[PDB]
């Protein structure tokens, strides 16, 4: 048994806790989860190797940043969840999320997760974002984030469809088990 | 009648202790919650520590003031109000000077604590 502190970071209303509750507890949170932060534990396998995950559901608020930055130490992989429905969450990942996780953990591997890849094609999300003057995060856009901020991989998840959830966290683990070059 | 949200995801600290965030239930007597916290920080002698809000209060968690434990309010475990009182008898009356001054600023800040009082 080998544990990885995978502090899942990411904005509010973008899908950290949705991805986690779909992962650790296997449920899609109906409403925006009021998050301070949590501790979970599951049993997952990574490319044929089973691993232990002691996980952290940190807050996306600007308020309890001191507590979330207390969570960043001991972290071995940073899961940054930003809404594809809200690419301003992608911009926040570019400005604060990745920079703060790196200021608290330099060179500690970071997974990049595009939450709600199922909405890149859903009419409501596209129409809302076009009315907001932005487009849902294309895999090239998240991949540009990943190359720019040295994310080990840019994944996408849809907690509504349970898409990529276990895949997201196995990749988070193998960001550490197999360090990316 | 019905109780408030007892299951509350709060930070629990002790000065020098890295917080560990569980789903604390407030129904059981506070001796048991303080017991689990203290054992988590490898602390026996439970009656000599009482939790306190890491709020600007620094007010010790007894049974009177644990309905102020809201989601996100950090709990800062520390010496129980009786232990703080005894600490203050010995560091308010003594012949040390700096210790009196700082302990007395503590006592001034802490007098508002009815639980300590
Ligand atoms: N349709 C859809 N909505 C999602 C998905 N993931 C998250 N959401 C929405 O995002 C909202 C908030 O969930 P999270 O993204 O987990 O919130 P968070 O990232 O944990 O941020 P905080 O809880 O504030 O710390 C939910 O109410 C969902 O409506 C998804 O995969 N599909
Ligand atoms: Mg969250």
Mutate to test the pocket of ligand 1, among A14, A30, A80 (most ligand atoms within 8 A of CB): A14
> Which residues, in sequence order, are bridge partners of residue B78?
B50
Q: Of A59, A20, A22, which is closest to residue A40 (Cα–Cα)?
A: A20
The CA distance from B117 to B112, in Å, is: 8
The CA distance from A82 to A69, in Å, is: 18
Residue of A nearest to B73 (CA): A36
CB atoms within 10 A of CB A113: 33
Does residue A13 line the site of ligand 1, with CB under 6 A?
yes
- E strand residue ranges, chain A: 3-10, 39-46, 49-57, 78-83, 110-115, 153-157
The CA distance from A23 to A77, in Å, is: 16
Candidates A8, A20, A34, A36, partner chain B, best to mutate (most B CBs within 10 A): A36
Q: Are B13 and B77 in contact (CB under 8 A)?
A: yes
The CA distance from B14 to B110, in Å, is: 17
Residue of B nearest to A61 (CA): B72
Q: How far is the CA of A101 from the centre of ligand 1 (A)?
A: 20
Q: Are B67 and B10 in contact (CB under 8 A)?
A: no
The CA distance from A170 to A164, in Å, is: 10
Measured torsion, CA atoms of residues B76, B77, B82, B84, in degrees rounded to the nearest 10: -60
Ligand sitting nearest the alpha carbon of A32: 1
Tokens standing for residue B29: 């007597």
Q: How far is the CA of A100 from the centre of ligand 1 (A)?
A: 21
For residues B64-92, one letter each, b for 16 or more C-beta atoms within 10 angstroms of the residue's C-beta and e for the rest, the string is ebbeebeebbbbbbbbbbebbeeebeebe
> Which residues, in sequence order, are bridge partners of residue B1?
none
Helix (H) or strand (E) holding A99: helix A98-104
Mutate to test the pocket of ligand 1, among A21, A22, A26, A32 (most ligand atoms within 8 A of CB): A32
The CA distance from B90 to B78, in Å, is: 18
**CA Rg value for chain B:** 15
Minimal CA separation from B16 to chain A, in Å: 12
Helix (H) or strand (E) holding B13: strand B12-13
């Amino acid at each position: 048994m080998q544990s990885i502190k995978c502090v899942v970071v990411g904005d509010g209303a973008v899908g950290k806790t949705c991805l986690l509750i779909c992962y650790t507890t296997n449920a899609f949170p109906k409403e925006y989860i009021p998050t301070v932060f949590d501790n979970y534990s599951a049993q997952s396998a990574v490319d044929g190797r089973t691993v232990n995950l002691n996980l952290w559901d940190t807050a996306g608020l600007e308020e309890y940043d001191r507590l979330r930055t207390l969570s960043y130490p001991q972290t071995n992989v940073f899961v940054i969840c930003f809404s594809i429905a809200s690419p301003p969450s992608y911009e926040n990942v570019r400005h604060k999320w990745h920079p703060e996780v790196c200021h608290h953990c330099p060179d500690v591997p970071i997974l990049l997760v595009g939450t709600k890849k199922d909405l890149r094609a859903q009419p409501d999300t596209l129409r809302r974002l076009k009315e907001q003057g932005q487009a849902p995060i294309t895999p090239q856009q998240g991949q540009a984030l990943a190359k720019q901020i040295h994310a080990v991989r840019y994944l996408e998840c849809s907690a509504l469809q349970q898409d990529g959830v276990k895949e997201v966290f196995a990749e988070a683990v193998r960001a550490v088990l197999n360090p990316t070059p | 009648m019905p109780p408030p949200a007892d299951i509350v995801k709060v930070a629990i600290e002790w000065p020098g202790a890295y917080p560990k965030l569980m789903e604390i239930d407030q129904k059981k007597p506070l001796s048991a919650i303080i017991k689990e916290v203290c054992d988590g920080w490898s602390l026996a002698n439970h009656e000599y520590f009482a939790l306190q809000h890491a709020d600007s209060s620094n007010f010790y968690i007894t049974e009177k003031n644990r309905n102020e434990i809201k989601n996100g309010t950090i709990l800062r475990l520390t010496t129980s109000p009786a232990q703080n009182a005894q600490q203050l008898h010995e560091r308010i009356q003594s012949s040390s000077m700096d210790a009196k001054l700082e302990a007395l600023k503590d006592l001034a800040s802490l007098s508002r604590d009815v639980t300590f009082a």
